């Protein structure tokens, strides 16, 4: 695809990856380079820096306050008093002024602007944070916090029942607690009153509290974010924290009974002896239909039209793709038609995976549900590719270096047989030195280095009360943590599919 033959295309995630190949193959030219940001569906990360390469952006002073930006730390005395409040909105803008100049500017705004004149004066002090929690100036804590994570203090129960308020403490919370970064900001989080905290930030609250062996502070937490929590998943989460803790047996029957299927409903079942969840069977009898399965274009096409779909307009996509061949953007379409109430766990292309054993089998599905719903051109916002969603660094590394297939290029990854055969491959690597599938999991997501750094802590995985769910909760980087337990629940689904099933209690055993 030329550059000519690409700007004719939607934008889109696709769009954007050809782009980014030209710009990585030195094919796009200055001149190409003019319009090119307005071609570009996601204009973030690599693609961006890519094209700045060729043309830097100036971008963006508001022409409203251009000339605030002509003063420094030496003349702000001479701005105009709209110009100084600009400038202040910044504090390593603060903490550049000398310290005379931060008294003049606190009494010009202590009227008007006393949020700017309580970060003035703190940083005339040793510790802006000391006396910013002095004050309980709930928006400079946060821009100080914002400024730099090393403040750290002890806050009294006034202070932090004040800060969930703020946009910024779920981020804020979450971050020191998964990272177990601020000791004195966890700690004093323990005194939050769980009437004042929802949904994760409840949660993360009541990981904080069993952190610090506070059972019944962590229990209210997470009675609390199961009472909130929008998504069915997350509040079986938290149910499970609750059972965890205080051992009702009303809670894990509730439990038990989710219409989520996650690790912490199928747990529940297993422990109460109640059935396996019913997997739906899509088996369409039509082979065929006109739809280009390997067209990457095509399927950001019907992707924005079935998210945008009505109800009625899902009825009439739902039949076109009930094929064989377009078996997964079916079950893509059916997932939503019915507001996500079944579980539907398809195995397409079958045929590249069926040699090997049943437990590979179903750890190759699990990991492909997860990636792309078994879209065999799925590209991400990373553009990793096709149903394994491998990164082109990986995929030529494998199809190079190791698999020398002729003529190889990273699309192959978009060919089921490619995707399954690559991912079965490095499945082997990852496997071979974790072992457990939850492992393999959060390895084949976040790299094998977080992993083993994450599993070589003696405060991860090891033996504890609430091990290994505890663990669960910390692994410090968010995408793989979710992705982590929602693979091993697709695990234990296939398996049990694949008549080879095992008890998910054997698999939290293992984790230990
Ligand atoms: C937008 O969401 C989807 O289409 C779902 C299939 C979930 O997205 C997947 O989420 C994984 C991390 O949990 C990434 O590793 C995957 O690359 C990512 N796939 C894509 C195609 O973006």
Known sequence: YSIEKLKKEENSLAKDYYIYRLLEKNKISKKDAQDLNSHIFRYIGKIKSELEKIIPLKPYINPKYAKCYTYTANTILDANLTCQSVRLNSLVFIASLNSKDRTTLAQTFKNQRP??????????????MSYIVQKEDINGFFKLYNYSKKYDLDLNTSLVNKLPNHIGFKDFAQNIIIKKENPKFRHSMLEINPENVSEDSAFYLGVNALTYDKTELAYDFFKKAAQSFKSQSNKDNAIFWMWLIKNNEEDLKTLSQSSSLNIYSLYAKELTNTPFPKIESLNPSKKKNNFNMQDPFAWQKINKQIRDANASQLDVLAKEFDTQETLPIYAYILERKNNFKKHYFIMPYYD?????????????????????????????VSYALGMMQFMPF????????????????????????????????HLNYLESRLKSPLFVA?????????????????????????????????????????????????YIVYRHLLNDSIKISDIFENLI
Do not use: C, W
């Open 394 to 425: 990986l995929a030529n590394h494998i199809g190079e270096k190791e698999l020398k297939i002729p003529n190889f290029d990273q699309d192959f990854m978009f060919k089921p047989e490619i995707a399954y055969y690559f991912g079965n491959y």
């Open 352 to 380: 590249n995976i069926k040699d090997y054993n049943k437990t590979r089998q179903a750890l190759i599905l699990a990991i492909a549900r997860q990636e792309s719903r078994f879209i065999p051109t799925a590209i991400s």
């Open 115 to 128: 949020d700017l004149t309580n970060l003035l004066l703190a940083f005339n002090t040793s510790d802006p």
């Open 442 to 490: 959060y390895a084949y997501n976040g790299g094998i280095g977080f992993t083993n750094r994450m599993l070589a802590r003696n405060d991860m995985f090891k033996t504890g009360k609430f091990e290994p769910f505890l663990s669960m909760e910390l692994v410090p980087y968010q995408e793989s943590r979710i992705y982590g337990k929602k693979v091993l629940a697709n």
